[PDB]
Amino acid sequence: DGVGNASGNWHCDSTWLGDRVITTSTRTWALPTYNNHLYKQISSASTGASNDNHYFGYSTPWGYFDFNRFHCHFSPRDWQRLINNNWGFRPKRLNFKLFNIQVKEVTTNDGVTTIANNLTSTVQVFSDSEYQLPYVLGSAHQGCLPPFPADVFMIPQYGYLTLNNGSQAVGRSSFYCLEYFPSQMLRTGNNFTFSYTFEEVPFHSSYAHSQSLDRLMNPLIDQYLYYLNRTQNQSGSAQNKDLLFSRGSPAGMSVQPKNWLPGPCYRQQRVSKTKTDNNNSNFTWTGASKYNLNGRESIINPGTAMASHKDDEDKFFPMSGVMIFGKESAGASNTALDNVMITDEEEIKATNPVATERFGTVAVNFQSSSTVPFKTDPATGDVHAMGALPGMVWQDRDVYLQGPIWAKIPHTDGHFHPSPLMGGFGLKNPPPQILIKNTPVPANPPAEFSATKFASFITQYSTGQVSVEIEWELQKENSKRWNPEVQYTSNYAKSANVDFTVDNNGLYTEPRPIGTRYLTRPL
Amino acid sequence: DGVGNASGNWHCDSTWLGDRVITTSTRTWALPTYNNHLYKQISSASTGASNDNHYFGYSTPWGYFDFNRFHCHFSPRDWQRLINNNWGFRPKRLNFKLFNIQVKEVTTNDGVTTIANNLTSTVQVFSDSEYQLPYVLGSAHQGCLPPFPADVFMIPQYGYLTLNNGSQAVGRSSFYCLEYFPSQMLRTGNNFTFSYTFEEVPFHSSYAHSQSLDRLMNPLIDQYLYYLNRTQNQSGSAQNKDLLFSRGSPAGMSVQPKNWLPGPCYRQQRVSKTKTDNNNSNFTWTGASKYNLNGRESIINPGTAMASHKDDEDKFFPMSGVMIFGKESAGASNTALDNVMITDEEEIKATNPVATERFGTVAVNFQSSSTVPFKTDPATGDVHAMGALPGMVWQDRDVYLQGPIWAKIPHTDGHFHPSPLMGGFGLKNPPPQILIKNTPVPANPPAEFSATKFASFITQYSTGQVSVEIEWELQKENSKRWNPEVQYTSNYAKSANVDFTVDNNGLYTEPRPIGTRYLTRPL
Amino acid sequence: DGVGNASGNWHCDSTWLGDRVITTSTRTWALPTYNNHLYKQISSASTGASNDNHYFGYSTPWGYFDFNRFHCHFSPRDWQRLINNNWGFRPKRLNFKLFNIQVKEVTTNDGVTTIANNLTSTVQVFSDSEYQLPYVLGSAHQGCLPPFPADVFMIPQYGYLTLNNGSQAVGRSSFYCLEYFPSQMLRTGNNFTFSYTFEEVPFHSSYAHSQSLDRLMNPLIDQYLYYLNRTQNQSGSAQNKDLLFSRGSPAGMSVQPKNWLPGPCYRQQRVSKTKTDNNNSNFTWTGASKYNLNGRESIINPGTAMASHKDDEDKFFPMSGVMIFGKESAGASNTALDNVMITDEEEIKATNPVATERFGTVAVNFQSSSTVPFKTDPATGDVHAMGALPGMVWQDRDVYLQGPIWAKIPHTDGHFHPSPLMGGFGLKNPPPQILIKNTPVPANPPAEFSATKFASFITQYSTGQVSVEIEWELQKENSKRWNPEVQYTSNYAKSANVDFTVDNNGLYTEPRPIGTRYLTRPL
C-alpha cells in the first residue's frame, strides 16, 4: 500500500466474553539471512556422536513463525483469570497477520557498519496448509513469540531430519526444497494474512478431582459383595486353613470390590531435590527409563502422565517424568537446580499412579499345600510398566503458561489416546507452519557471463510486526462445593520485585510455572 | 436360459479411473462331491494329538468360494501401478457371479472312466449374508482363485470347528446344517449373482515414513525444556553428587523431551537366515512367544506389527513374526529356506519397535545413598512385552500381493484396534461366504420300500466360471519431496525367465512377495 | 438361440457395384486344444541355433483367425475382373461373423476313438481392438482361410516373441495373459459379430506405366538447356582440351536434363533360374543383402520395390528380392524350382531400378590436369545402395491373389513411406486379431481337496463357420489409349486340367501367381 503507509496496527489485547476468550498478541521480529541462502545437508558424521545421537537432515535458508506456547497469548493475569474460573478450555480459531515489513541492507567496511533501507527487496512467506513439510513445531523449541509484548525476537531457522542409518541417509530419505512452494512476495508496503480453524478437540481439564479413585464408595453403607478375607483360622490356637469370606465394609476400604482401575504406568527413577539423598553415581542415562527404536535408545521424558510423588514426599521427582523450565540466567548445559523450575503433577494422584512407584503387584505362581510333598507358597511380583487395561481411567498432563499448546499427531495407522506427552492438544491438522525468508539480492555480476551459480549476495535482514489472534472456548465451572476453592494467587508481602514483571535492568522474568488445575470437581 | 446358451462372459480386466480402480477376475472352477454328501463329525481323538492341538468340529459336503488374496484381483503389473503411485487404498464394493454351470456324471468300469453331461442336475449356491455360519475365511487357507487367470482351480471343502474340551464337545458346541438355509438351485442354464458393499474401513497405508519418531525435532534450534543431565560433579577431581540440568539441544537428541512413544511390542526370538549362527536346538516351540487360552498354548504368529530387524541386520528375522510364503515346489512339511519366501517389515522402523528386541528399560527400585547404611544403586529392567500406553503411535502390518485382503472382526464386547494381525482390513460385516455343492442324485432305488436313508448316489462333479469384480478407492500421493522416490521395479538383466510369468512347462510362479510401502510421507 | 437352431447362414458371394465390390467368404474351421490349456515359454536354448536365429517368447493356448490373403476373399474370376478393369483398389470396411459352434468331446480307449457332442461347453472369442497384444498377423503365416470355399481349415495357434538377449529374456520382455481380456463365451447356440472400418489408405495401383521415367520428353523438339558435351577437341587431329556445350536434343536422350530420379535401391545378388549359370557355392547367406540389428543379421527379403530383371533377362531374379509362392506338393525345406512359383516385378521398370544392378555411378575424386605434376583422371564409383533423394519417384510392390493384404505399421517415432515391403496396405490400426479358444473342462476332481492346479482335462475341440465380408473401393480406368490393353487371360488350349480348379483327387491348386498391373496409364 506504499512506502509511507503502515500496513497494520498493534493489536495486543484480551477480550473475555461469556464462554469465549479472544487473545491477540503483536510482536516485533527480526529475520536474518540463514546459510547464505543455501540449503545444507547436516548430519552427525563430523560431530562423532554416539549411536543414539546419530542424525541426518537438512538446514534450509528459511525461518519459521512459532507461537506454540501459552504465554505467547496469555498474560499471567489472563492465565490466572482463566485457571481460577474455568473447568476447561480449548482453542477454536486463529488469525495470523504479518505487517510493516522493512528490509535493511548491511555493509561493514573498515570495522564500521552501515544499515540502510532496501525499499525494493522482498520477503517470501508461505503457510504449509497441506502439511507437505516435516512438522518441526510441537518439539518444544526456542524461537516462539516472547512472553512480554515489548520484547523483539529473532526468527528461528528451519531445518528438518529425515531417515538415517547412523550418520548416513537411505533411499527413502526425503529432501524438501521450500522454494518448490507458492510463496507470497512482500515488499515494504505489503502484508500477509492467514486464517485457521481448529478441529473439535476435547477441552483441557483445568480442574483437579475432589475424590480419589479408590475412595468412590459410600463410607456408611456396607456392600452386598463378599471377598475372601482369611485362608487360615482366625482363632489362632490352631493354625488350620479355611475359607472365610467378609462383606465389603467401610472398615476395610482397600479390599472392597471396585469398578475402575488407575491409569497406565511406566515407572521412572526417583531423584531427590536434596542432592545428599541421591546415589553417588551419574545414572541419568544408565538408570533411566528409555525406549528402543531401530537400535538406538531414547529417554522417555516425560512419558505417561503420572503423579510426581506421593503425599508428604515433595522432595522427590521422577528423573525424566517432569517438565523442567529454565529460569532466566540458566545455562545451556549442567545448570543448577536453583536455575531450573521443576513442575509438579500432584493434582492427578486421584486417578494416576505415582511416577516413581510400581503400578501394583501380580500373582506369579500357583499356591498349593504339601501332599506332591513340595508346598508352594503364593508369590507376587511388582508391575513396573502397565499398559492399558479395560476399566482404566486417567488424567492427562497439565498445561503451563510457559508450556506448549498443541502438537501434530503423527500420520500413522494406529495411535492410542493421541494426547501429546508434553501436554496440550493433539491435532491431526494443527496450525500450519508459516515459513519466511529474505529473497536473495545478488551483488554485482561479472562483465562476462558465468554459468557458475551466484555466491555473492547483498547482505540484508528484515524486521516487522506479527499478530496472532486465538479464540478459545471456555468450559465454566458448575460446582456445588460449599467451602472455598484453591486459587492461584499472588503472594501479599513486601518483596524487592513484583512477580511476572521486569527488574531494574529491564529483564522480564517468570518466577514459577503455573498450571491449570486449581478448581475441583467430583470424580 | 437354456442348454445351448451361455449364461455369462469372461470378464477379466482392470480399469483405472482417477481415484478408483475396478478389478475383474474370471476363473474356471471344479467342484467335486465331498464326504459322499454327508456331514461328518471330526475331532483329534483318532489323531492322538497333543493337548494344544485338540479340536472338535464338523466337515460338511459343501465347498466355498474364496477370493481373499490380493493376487486373485491384481496382476503384478496392476499391483506395481497401485503401490508406486498411491499413498493408500481400500475396497468399496464387489460383484460376484457364477455362470456356465456344467454337471458331469462319472462312471468307472473295469478301470476305464466315462464322463457324460448331466443336463438335469443342479448345484445349490447360497451366500451367508447374515453371518449365521462360522466364518472360516480370513484364516489364510488354500483354495482361493489362482493368481494366473488361465488356471483352473478346485473348490475347497467347507468345515468348521466348535467348542471342544480336549477331543470332546461341550453343551454349547454348535452344529450347523447348511441345508437349513435357502439355496438357489442352478441347472446348466442358470447363473447366480450377488452384490456387496464394504463398510467404511480406513485406507491401507501404501507409504513408508520419511522421518523417524525419535527424530521429529528441528536439528538447529535448542529446546526450552531442561532435563537432569548429571547427578555427579562433571569436573571429576572429586566424586561428589550434584543435580545438573541441561537444555534440550541437537547435540543430544536421545535425551530431548518428546511428545510420542513407539507402538506396543511383544518380543519374538531372533533367528538368523544363516543357519550356522543359530543355537543347536529345536526351540521353535520351547523358545517361542505363545499365548495361553483355556489351558492350551498357541504360537502368536505374527502378532504385533513390529520391524523384522534393525539396520544392517537383514540376516535376522523374528521366529514367528513374519509372513512366510512358499514358492512353487515347496513341500508341506520341513521344506527349505530356499523354498520359502520370508517377508520383511523394514519400512515401519520409523514408528514400531524391532520385533526381536525389548521395548525399552524401566526403573525397578528406589535409588538412595548410604546413611540406613545400605546404599541402593538404581536398577533397570528390560521391558519385553509392552501394552498400549497413551501417546503411542504405530503402523500396521503391510499387505502383499500374495497375502490376505480382509478378516472378519470377532463379535466380542471389546476389541482394541481391530486390524488383522496377518495384515489387511478388519471388517465387522466382511464379504459373506458363498457356499456351493452338487445336489445329490440317488442311484437306482430298491423295488421294495426301505426307510434306511440313501447311501448309493450317482457320482458327479460340476464345473463352471466365477467372476469377482471389486471397486477400490485410491488415496493419491500429494508429496512435495524433491528427490526421486523408491519404486518397485523389474530387474533389467538377461535372465533365463521373466519374473511373474510361466516357464517352459507352463507353471506360473511368483519370484518374490511384493509389499505396498514404496512411496514416502513425513511422519 | 438354442441347440436345434442355426445361428448363421452360408454367405459366400461377390457383388460388383459401380465403384465398390463387396466380397463375402464363409469357411468351416476346426479349433483344437493347444498346449493342454497352458501358457508355455519358448526360446532357442534347447534348439541350439545360431546367434542370428535366437529368440524368446511365449506360446498361448489360443488360436487366431487370419484372412490376410487376397484369395480368402476373391475367386480367380473376381480377381481377373478386378485387375483387368480397375486402375486401383483399396479396402473400405469389413464384417466378421462366427457362427454354428459345435464343441466335440473325444475319448480314445483301446485304440478306438469316440466323438460326442458337448452341448454345454464354450469357446471364448475376443477381438483385440485396442492393439494391446503383439500383432502376429502381417508376417505372411499359414493358417488363413483357404482359397477354395469347400475347404475346411484348422485354426493356427497364437504365440508371440518378446525382447531377447540370445536365448534369454530381459527386464523389458513382456508377457501377456490372453485370459486377462474380456472374452465372449459362446455355447452351441451363440454367435459372434464384429465390424471394422479401414482408415483412408491410398489406392493400390493396378496399373503399369506406358512411359519410362527417362523418356518423358517430346521426341521432336530440342531443349533450351545446354550440357557439357566435350572436354576435348572434336576434330581429333590434335588432342587439346576444350569446353564444348550441346543442346538437349532427341538424338541424345540419355544426356538431356531431366526433372526426376528413379526410386531408391538396395542391390541384391543375381541368381539365374537356369542353375548351370550360377556360381558353384552356396552363397545364399554369405553373398546376400542383409541388415544388422542388435548384433544379429537378417536377410532383407524382399526389401525395396525394384524390378526383378532387365529386358530380355527373364532368366535372372534377385536372390531375396522376389515373393516366392510354393505350389501344392512343395516340401517345407529344400524344395525344387519346379515346386515354387517365383513372382516378377517387370512392370515397374519404368520408375524403379533393377534389383540386381547398381543405382548408378557417382564421382569420387577431383579431376585435374598436370602442372603439381600429378595428373588426376576423373573417377567414378558404383552406387549399390541409394537412400531417398528429393525428386525420386517409385512404385510399390505388386499385390497377388495369393499374397497378403495389409500389415500393421509399427508404432514408432518415425517411418518413411510406411508401405509393407511384402506388398499391400500399411495400416496404423489394422483389422484386429480375433482370438478364440476352447474353455477348459476339467476331468473328475479328487474326493479330497488339493490346491495343486488342475492338469486333467476333458479332451475336446470345436468346429464352426466363419464369415468375412469386405467392402472395397475401386478406382476405375479413365484411359484414352487407342490400342487394346494387356489383360490377364486364361489360355485357350486343350489341357488335362482347368487352371484354378480341382483335380480328380479333389485338390484345389493355383497354377501361377497373378498380379494386378495389367492396365496402363501415362507416367
PDB file of C-alpha atoms in Angstrom, chain C residues 156-294:
ATOM      1  CA  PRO C 156      -3.455 -71.686 -36.085  1.00  0.00           C
ATOM      2  CA  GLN C 157      -2.050 -71.339 -32.590  1.00  0.00           C
ATOM      3  CA  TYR C 158      -1.248 -67.920 -31.168  1.00  0.00           C
ATOM      4  CA  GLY C 159       2.248 -67.169 -29.954  1.00  0.00           C
ATOM      5  CA  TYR C 160       4.478 -64.146 -29.815  1.00  0.00           C
ATOM      6  CA  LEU C 161       8.096 -63.154 -29.373  1.00  0.00           C
ATOM      7  CA  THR C 162       9.457 -60.582 -26.951  1.00  0.00           C
ATOM      8  CA  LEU C 163      12.790 -58.890 -26.339  1.00  0.00           C
ATOM      9  CA  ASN C 164      15.606 -61.412 -26.124  1.00  0.00           C
ATOM     10  CA  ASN C 165      19.318 -61.352 -25.308  1.00  0.00           C
ATOM     11  CA  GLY C 166      20.346 -64.518 -27.068  1.00  0.00           C
ATOM     12  CA  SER C 167      18.047 -67.247 -25.821  1.00  0.00           C
ATOM     13  CA  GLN C 168      17.407 -65.262 -22.621  1.00  0.00           C
ATOM     14  CA  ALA C 169      14.917 -62.550 -21.748  1.00  0.00           C
ATOM     15  CA  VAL C 170      15.450 -59.041 -20.395  1.00  0.00           C
ATOM     16  CA  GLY C 171      13.647 -56.882 -17.865  1.00  0.00           C
ATOM     17  CA  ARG C 172      11.569 -55.185 -20.560  1.00  0.00           C
ATOM     18  CA  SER C 173      10.469 -58.502 -22.046  1.00  0.00           C
ATOM     19  CA  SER C 174       6.686 -58.579 -21.859  1.00  0.00           C
ATOM     20  CA  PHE C 175       4.301 -61.381 -21.009  1.00  0.00           C
ATOM     21  CA  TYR C 176       0.636 -61.291 -21.995  1.00  0.00           C
ATOM     22  CA  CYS C 177      -2.074 -63.424 -20.463  1.00  0.00           C
ATOM     23  CA  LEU C 178      -4.877 -63.501 -23.009  1.00  0.00           C
ATOM     24  CA  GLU C 179      -7.331 -64.523 -20.289  1.00  0.00           C
ATOM     25  CA  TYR C 180      -6.697 -61.031 -18.906  1.00  0.00           C
ATOM     26  CA  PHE C 181      -9.061 -59.736 -21.610  1.00  0.00           C
ATOM     27  CA  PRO C 182     -12.863 -59.614 -21.699  1.00  0.00           C
ATOM     28  CA  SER C 183     -13.989 -62.535 -23.854  1.00  0.00           C
ATOM     29  CA  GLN C 184     -17.384 -63.536 -25.157  1.00  0.00           C
ATOM     30  CA  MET C 185     -18.229 -67.112 -24.179  1.00  0.00           C
ATOM     31  CA  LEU C 186     -20.157 -68.949 -26.891  1.00  0.00           C
ATOM     32  CA  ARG C 187     -22.174 -72.104 -26.408  1.00  0.00           C
ATOM     33  CA  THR C 188     -23.577 -74.003 -29.373  1.00  0.00           C
ATOM     34  CA  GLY C 189     -26.450 -71.552 -29.871  1.00  0.00           C
ATOM     35  CA  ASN C 190     -24.412 -68.344 -29.743  1.00  0.00           C
ATOM     36  CA  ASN C 191     -22.652 -66.337 -32.433  1.00  0.00           C
ATOM     37  CA  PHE C 192     -20.057 -63.569 -32.511  1.00  0.00           C
ATOM     38  CA  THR C 193     -20.074 -60.455 -34.698  1.00  0.00           C
ATOM     39  CA  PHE C 194     -17.571 -57.665 -35.187  1.00  0.00           C
ATOM     40  CA  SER C 195     -17.398 -54.677 -37.541  1.00  0.00           C
ATOM     41  CA  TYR C 196     -14.337 -52.707 -38.578  1.00  0.00           C
ATOM     42  CA  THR C 197     -13.709 -49.647 -40.746  1.00  0.00           C
ATOM     43  CA  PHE C 198     -10.436 -49.205 -42.597  1.00  0.00           C
ATOM     44  CA  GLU C 199      -8.585 -45.922 -42.367  1.00  0.00           C
ATOM     45  CA  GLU C 200      -8.184 -43.858 -45.527  1.00  0.00           C
ATOM     46  CA  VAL C 201      -5.294 -45.725 -47.153  1.00  0.00           C
ATOM     47  CA  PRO C 202      -4.082 -44.899 -50.689  1.00  0.00           C
ATOM     48  CA  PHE C 203      -5.368 -46.997 -53.555  1.00  0.00           C
ATOM     49  CA  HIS C 204      -3.134 -49.833 -54.603  1.00  0.00           C
ATOM     50  CA  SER C 205      -2.018 -49.310 -58.198  1.00  0.00           C
ATOM     51  CA  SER C 206      -3.448 -51.960 -60.524  1.00  0.00           C
ATOM     52  CA  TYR C 207      -1.664 -50.326 -63.461  1.00  0.00           C
ATOM     53  CA  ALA C 208       1.674 -50.245 -65.198  1.00  0.00           C
ATOM     54  CA  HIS C 209       3.141 -47.110 -66.738  1.00  0.00           C
ATOM     55  CA  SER C 210       3.074 -46.619 -70.502  1.00  0.00           C
ATOM     56  CA  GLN C 211       6.121 -44.339 -70.298  1.00  0.00           C
ATOM     57  CA  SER C 212       9.546 -44.708 -68.745  1.00  0.00           C
ATOM     58  CA  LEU C 213      10.892 -42.073 -66.381  1.00  0.00           C
ATOM     59  CA  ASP C 214      13.887 -41.312 -68.612  1.00  0.00           C
ATOM     60  CA  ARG C 215      11.610 -40.999 -71.665  1.00  0.00           C
ATOM     61  CA  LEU C 216       9.186 -38.258 -70.620  1.00  0.00           C
ATOM     62  CA  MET C 217      10.284 -35.725 -73.244  1.00  0.00           C
ATOM     63  CA  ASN C 218       8.925 -34.634 -76.586  1.00  0.00           C
ATOM     64  CA  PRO C 219      10.949 -36.684 -79.111  1.00  0.00           C
ATOM     65  CA  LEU C 220      10.631 -33.991 -81.805  1.00  0.00           C
ATOM     66  CA  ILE C 221      11.610 -30.745 -80.069  1.00  0.00           C
ATOM     67  CA  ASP C 222      15.006 -29.738 -78.733  1.00  0.00           C
ATOM     68  CA  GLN C 223      15.602 -28.284 -75.288  1.00  0.00           C
ATOM     69  CA  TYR C 224      16.641 -24.777 -74.356  1.00  0.00           C
ATOM     70  CA  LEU C 225      19.069 -26.205 -71.784  1.00  0.00           C
ATOM     71  CA  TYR C 226      22.702 -26.903 -72.609  1.00  0.00           C
ATOM     72  CA  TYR C 227      25.039 -29.520 -71.195  1.00  0.00           C
ATOM     73  CA  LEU C 228      28.777 -30.056 -71.328  1.00  0.00           C
ATOM     74  CA  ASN C 229      29.272 -32.445 -74.247  1.00  0.00           C
ATOM     75  CA  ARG C 230      33.031 -32.492 -74.907  1.00  0.00           C
ATOM     76  CA  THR C 231      36.057 -31.627 -72.811  1.00  0.00           C
ATOM     77  CA  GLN C 232      38.385 -32.387 -75.744  1.00  0.00           C
ATOM     78  CA  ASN C 233      38.566 -31.114 -79.306  1.00  0.00           C
ATOM     79  CA  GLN C 234      36.164 -32.866 -81.657  1.00  0.00           C
ATOM     80  CA  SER C 235      38.441 -32.738 -84.720  1.00  0.00           C
ATOM     81  CA  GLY C 236      40.950 -35.244 -83.342  1.00  0.00           C
ATOM     82  CA  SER C 237      43.949 -34.065 -85.378  1.00  0.00           C
ATOM     83  CA  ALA C 238      45.182 -32.588 -82.105  1.00  0.00           C
ATOM     84  CA  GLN C 239      44.263 -33.834 -78.629  1.00  0.00           C
ATOM     85  CA  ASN C 240      43.622 -30.487 -76.950  1.00  0.00           C
ATOM     86  CA  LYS C 241      41.136 -29.885 -74.171  1.00  0.00           C
ATOM     87  CA  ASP C 242      38.070 -27.685 -74.577  1.00  0.00           C
ATOM     88  CA  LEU C 243      34.649 -26.840 -73.139  1.00  0.00           C
ATOM     89  CA  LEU C 244      32.036 -27.641 -75.786  1.00  0.00           C
ATOM     90  CA  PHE C 245      28.340 -27.435 -74.939  1.00  0.00           C
ATOM     91  CA  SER C 246      25.452 -29.071 -76.773  1.00  0.00           C
ATOM     92  CA  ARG C 247      21.719 -28.505 -76.703  1.00  0.00           C
ATOM     93  CA  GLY C 248      19.389 -31.164 -75.358  1.00  0.00           C
ATOM     94  CA  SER C 249      18.169 -32.956 -78.470  1.00  0.00           C
ATOM     95  CA  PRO C 250      16.147 -36.091 -79.282  1.00  0.00           C
ATOM     96  CA  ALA C 251      19.315 -37.609 -80.763  1.00  0.00           C
ATOM     97  CA  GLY C 252      20.848 -37.919 -77.313  1.00  0.00           C
ATOM     98  CA  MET C 253      18.112 -38.593 -74.777  1.00  0.00           C
ATOM     99  CA  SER C 254      20.432 -40.003 -72.108  1.00  0.00           C
ATOM    100  CA  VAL C 255      22.210 -36.657 -71.607  1.00  0.00           C
ATOM    101  CA  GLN C 256      19.151 -34.409 -71.573  1.00  0.00           C
ATOM    102  CA  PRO C 257      18.473 -32.582 -68.300  1.00  0.00           C
ATOM    103  CA  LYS C 258      15.524 -34.185 -66.524  1.00  0.00           C
ATOM    104  CA  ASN C 259      13.258 -33.367 -63.603  1.00  0.00           C
ATOM    105  CA  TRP C 260      13.006 -36.628 -61.642  1.00  0.00           C
ATOM    106  CA  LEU C 261      15.060 -39.567 -60.400  1.00  0.00           C
ATOM    107  CA  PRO C 262      14.344 -43.302 -60.119  1.00  0.00           C
ATOM    108  CA  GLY C 263      13.380 -44.647 -56.731  1.00  0.00           C
ATOM    109  CA  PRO C 264      15.772 -45.881 -54.063  1.00  0.00           C
ATOM    110  CA  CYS C 265      17.664 -49.127 -54.421  1.00  0.00           C
ATOM    111  CA  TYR C 266      19.400 -51.736 -52.261  1.00  0.00           C
ATOM    112  CA  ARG C 267      21.223 -54.083 -54.595  1.00  0.00           C
ATOM    113  CA  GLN C 268      20.544 -57.826 -54.459  1.00  0.00           C
ATOM    114  CA  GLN C 269      22.524 -60.756 -55.812  1.00  0.00           C
ATOM    115  CA  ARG C 270      21.545 -62.044 -59.245  1.00  0.00           C
ATOM    116  CA  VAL C 271      20.522 -65.704 -59.419  1.00  0.00           C
ATOM    117  CA  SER C 272      19.734 -67.474 -62.676  1.00  0.00           C
ATOM    118  CA  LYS C 273      16.708 -69.745 -62.922  1.00  0.00           C
ATOM    119  CA  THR C 274      18.991 -71.943 -65.043  1.00  0.00           C
ATOM    120  CA  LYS C 275      21.175 -73.488 -62.362  1.00  0.00           C
ATOM    121  CA  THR C 276      24.219 -74.084 -64.591  1.00  0.00           C
ATOM    122  CA  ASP C 277      24.933 -70.342 -64.863  1.00  0.00           C
ATOM    123  CA  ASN C 278      25.135 -69.875 -61.088  1.00  0.00           C
ATOM    124  CA  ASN C 279      28.373 -69.947 -59.132  1.00  0.00           C
ATOM    125  CA  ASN C 280      29.341 -73.296 -57.610  1.00  0.00           C
ATOM    126  CA  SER C 281      28.875 -72.332 -53.971  1.00  0.00           C
ATOM    127  CA  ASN C 282      26.050 -71.821 -51.514  1.00  0.00           C
ATOM    128  CA  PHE C 283      26.266 -68.018 -51.072  1.00  0.00           C
ATOM    129  CA  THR C 284      22.591 -67.815 -50.091  1.00  0.00           C
ATOM    130  CA  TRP C 285      23.728 -66.430 -46.749  1.00  0.00           C
ATOM    131  CA  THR C 286      27.297 -65.239 -47.316  1.00  0.00           C
ATOM    132  CA  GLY C 287      26.515 -63.389 -50.541  1.00  0.00           C
ATOM    133  CA  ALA C 288      23.129 -61.976 -49.601  1.00  0.00           C
ATOM    134  CA  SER C 289      21.901 -58.493 -48.760  1.00  0.00           C
ATOM    135  CA  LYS C 290      21.153 -58.433 -45.048  1.00  0.00           C
ATOM    136  CA  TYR C 291      20.794 -55.895 -42.269  1.00  0.00           C
ATOM    137  CA  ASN C 292      22.358 -55.713 -38.821  1.00  0.00           C
ATOM    138  CA  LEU C 293      20.092 -55.223 -35.794  1.00  0.00           C
ATOM    139  CA  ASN C 294      21.336 -55.597 -32.204  1.00  0.00           C
TER     140      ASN C 294
END
